[PDB]
Amino acid sequence: SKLEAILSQEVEAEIQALLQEAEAKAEAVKREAEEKAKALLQARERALEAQYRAALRRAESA
Amino acid sequence: LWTRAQDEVARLKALEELASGRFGFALLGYVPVKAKPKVEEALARHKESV
């Protein structure tokens, strides 16, 4: 009834705070998980670019 | 101070006689029929009068 609903609503407020801490926990994982993915992609294209510049200076000196 | 302390200590000792319902709780006892209106007047102070 309404009385059990108010009680399970207090417990649902605890549960909602529990989902909010779990959701911000998953977010605090995956924001920087996405950003380490992009940091990998950045450093990878930069290492390839270094190899490209070495290739061009070597071919033109040959 | 002694009166408030004896009152709070009696409330604490009375809290030992409760009957929990797994994050929820019940209680039971007896009282006369002549104070049943006073019992209801006390019962109104519960949250939705649980």
UniProtKB/Swiss-Prot annotation, chain A:
Disulfide feature: none
UniProt function note: Produces ATP from ADP in the presence of a proton gradient across the membrane.
Family: Belongs to the V-ATPase E subunit family.
Name of the protein: V-type ATP synthase subunit E
Organism: Thermus thermophilus (strain ATCC 27634 / DSM 579 / HB8)
Gene: atpE
